[PDB]
Write a protein that binds this ligand. Structure first.
Ligand code: 6AP
Ligand code: ZN
Ligand code: ZN
Lengths: 182, 189
């Protein structure tokens, strides 16, 4: 809500809980299954059908999670990725996730990022991005990726951020089609 | 806050966002945005400020400055703060929602790729910049990989773009931040 002295984006109960309960998920598909549970919880708490979480890349320790809170939060910058990366940085007391001595961080996200989130992933210091639904899956339910540069993935890769896509794509599309139906 | 995204605003920014203010001329709007750059640098933030104004009346809606380092948040560019704070005050994610005056983002520098998408999603109908991307990069800030013809990109979404407005003063402030950036104490800073 509106504050005088802060930008303040409140989080619904499931998301506060997700950011404060201990969770180590070693396998990539474990990490992505949990992110898709957050998608489902978010849809039920009036949010867009997107979620993301920052994990320690090797251990799979969950550091923070975010979901689309654009409409209920009255904030167009409130995509899953922005919240997940920002909360991870708050937790780790730094604006730079690749700060010396911090373990390598990974953003596991329900769908390929829009142009804003593409830039946010670059500045964040995460070293790895893993996506489920593809860009055309997102467009097919009326979400816009915006004008991203051509070869956005190679843009990430050239800056030391490894990119995997398509992970539990079909599971993520099931939740997208469902949001679009309702 | 582990229960919210919470970026605190320094007092001078609370002040900027508290007092009613109307600036008709583009140069007046950018003059004010450049005062916030200097106040931000003195309040431990980066050399970047932006403000959302009603396009046709000059009424200030909200201002934002770069709070990346003090706010421990790489998303906290001036543009993201200005836009989000304006959306919070008017109680919509969409600055072009029915009933709302057309909004213009005035920004001390051309937007990086993240801020470029934020602009597109925000609903503002006008982007007005001072320093060019070349200026920003000249002192080690990185605009990142924007799409080819990013300005044409904005225009095709109906977002009119101006740049170079009070560019000299904005460059002078960038160079002054850069001269004071190092670790060796300089009383002149
Ligand atoms: N316009 C602009 N460009 C950057 N690289 C940047 N980094 C932090 N704030 C910024 N603003
Ligand atoms: Zn996004
Ligand atoms: Zn930016």
């Amino acid at each position: 809500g509106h504050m005088n002295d802060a930008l303040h984006i409140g989080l619904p109960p499931f998301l506060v809980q997700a950011n404060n309960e201990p969770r180590v998920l070693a396998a990539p598909e474990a990490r992505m299954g949990y992110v898709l549970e957050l998608v489902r919880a978010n849809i039920a708490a009036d949010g867009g059908p997107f979620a993301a979480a920052v994990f320690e890349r090797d251990s799979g320790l969950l550091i923070a999670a975010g979901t689309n809170r654009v409409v209920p939060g009255r904030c167009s910058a409130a995509h899953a990725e922005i919240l997940a990366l920002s909360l991870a940085q708050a937790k780790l007391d730094t604006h730079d996730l690749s700060a010396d001595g911090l373990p390598a961080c990974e953003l596991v996200t329900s769908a390929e990022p829009c142009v804003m989130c593409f830039g946010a992933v670059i500045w964040s210091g995460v070293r790895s991005l893993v996506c489920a639904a593809r860009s055309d899956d997102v467009e097919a339910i009326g979400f816009d990726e915006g004008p991203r540069p051509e070869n956005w993935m190679g843009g990430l890769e050239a800056r030391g951020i490894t990119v995997t896509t398509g992970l539990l794509r079909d599971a993520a599309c099931a939740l997208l089609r469902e949001y679009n139906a309702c």
